[PDB]
From Swiss-Prot, chain B:
Zn(2+) 1 binds at residues 8, 11, 30, 33. A zinc finger (TFIIS-type) spans 73-115. Zn(2+) 2 binds at residues 77, 80, 105, 110. The lineage of its organism: Eukaryota, Metazoa, Chordata, Craniata, Vertebrata. A zinc finger (C4-type) spans 8-33. Its main location: nucleus. This is DNA-directed RNA polymerase II subunit RPB9. One of its GO terms (molecular function) is zinc ion binding. One of its GO terms (cellular component) is RNA polymerase II, core complex. Belongs to the archaeal RpoM/eukaryotic RPA12/RPB9/RPC11 RNA polymerase family.
Length: 97, 116, 48, 131
């Protein structure tokens, strides 16, 4: 029901949910991470590595729910992480979220 | 103590104060209506130069469910006694000079807040 | 730019028809629309 | 199954798939296509009718846009971008709109003498677009 470009911003401190759909909202794709583990599992990598032979492409990843476009106005409310393995294993409890 | 606006009963407008010269008392009138009522607070205006505002009254429980807010276990709640809790600064402009935290308990139905 | 050029075209046809009806005769929209608005306007904007 | 420590390689397959599906200049093409797909129709539709003694409505709708052509002393032919570049031509295509002219006067008599595909102008077309 909602195209991938739409963005939902949750404002915690003041209860305001602002959703934007107009054009120009510069955005970029990121991987999703449910609890401490990515949704991009070996299955996806395998199917994708066999692309250009069958039909597999980025749209498959976007539909499967592994990647997601975040726009700058929504990027301010997401605990981003640099590399999957390094920043999640187990250490002093930084954010773990 | 503070003073809160009290609106008229018929016209539902701002009620100004008035000192009853005859009965020597404090009344609240309406600019438009002729509604009168005997005052009880016996105060009109107060100014807080220091602006001593309790940040706890501004913090809300919903902050707990925030994915970009640090979490600690060393400051368990009081009422529920849960372990997980979040902490953050005043996050309010015009912060005079303080980074005193405001811990908020991390659990449903508790919404407890405290400072150390 | 397209909105403005389209408005200009509308104004042009308006005045054209007005002048024609003033004589009581029927106007022809074929001559009312001026091609030198859209194409020329876009060419100018994208070139200069 | 999660992918531990075998992730430098798997990290660039997704990048390759993205850059294969969407080009480097994809935003330009998408913006222009959306323009030619909806913006023009929106602008031509939302414009109010025109009226002017007996008057008339003269309402517009239903644009059409054909492929680029040169002689839309020459017959029509599809101009290729290299041809236009080499001959200093405006690589554009004609734009048409179906117009319904309705004039009403005394005596309760009007006619919807509509005109199909009334040429309007030429719109330049970006290379490697939907049109
Ligand atoms: Zn009153
Ligand atoms: Zn608690």
């Amino acid at each position: 029901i909602i195209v991938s470009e739409v963005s939902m911003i949750r404002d915690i401190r003041e209860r305001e949910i602002r959703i934007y759909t107009d054009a120009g909202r510069i955005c970029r794709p990121l991987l999703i991470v449910e609890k401490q583990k990515l949704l991009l599992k070996k299955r996806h990598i395998d199917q994708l590595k066999e692309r250009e032979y069958n039909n597999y492409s980025w749209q498959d990843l976007v539909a499967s729910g592994v990647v997601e476009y975040i726009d700058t106005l929504e990027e301010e409310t997401v605990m981003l992480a640099m590399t999957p393995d390094d920043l999640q294993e187990k250490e002093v409890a930084y954010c773990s979220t | 103590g503070f003073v809160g606006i009290r609106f008229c009963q018929e016209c539902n407008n701002m009620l100004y104060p008035k000192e009853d010269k005859e009965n020597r008392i404090l009344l609240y009138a309406c600019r438009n209506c002729d509604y009168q009522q005997e005052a009880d607070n016996s105060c009109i205006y107060v100014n807080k130069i220091t602006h001593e505002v309790d940040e706890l009254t501004q913090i809300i429980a919903d902050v707990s469910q925030d994915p970009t807010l640090p979490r600690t276990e060393d400051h368990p709640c009081q009422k529920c006694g849960h372990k997980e809790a979040v902490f953050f600064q005043s996050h309010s402009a015009r912060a005079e000079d303080a980074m005193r935290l405001y811990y908020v308990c991390t659990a449903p139905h508790c919404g407890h807040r405290w400072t150390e | 730019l397209f909105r403005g050029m389209f408005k200009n075209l509308l104004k042009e046809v308006r005045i054209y028809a007005q002048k024609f009806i003033d004589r009581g005769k029927d106007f022809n929209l074929e001559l009312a629309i001026k091609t030198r608005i859209i194409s020329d306007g876009l060419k100018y904007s994208l070139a200069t | 199954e999660i992918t531990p420590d075998l992730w430098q390689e798997a990290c660039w397959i997704v990048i390759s798939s993205y850059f294969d599906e969407k080009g480097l200049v994809r935003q330009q093409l998408d913006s222009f296509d959306e323009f030619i797909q909806m913006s023009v129709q929106r602008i031509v539709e939302d414009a109010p009718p025109i009226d002017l003694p007996p008057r008339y409505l003269l309402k517009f709708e239903q644009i059409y846009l054909s492929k680029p052509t040169h002689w839309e002393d020459g017959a029509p032919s599809p101009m290729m971008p290299n041809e236009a570049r080499l001959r200093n031509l405006t690589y554009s295509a004609p734009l048409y709109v179906d117009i319904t002219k309705t004039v009403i006067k005394e005596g309760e008599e009007q006619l919807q003498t509509q005109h199909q595909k009334t040429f309007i102008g030429k719109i330049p077309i970006m290379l490697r677009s939907t049109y």
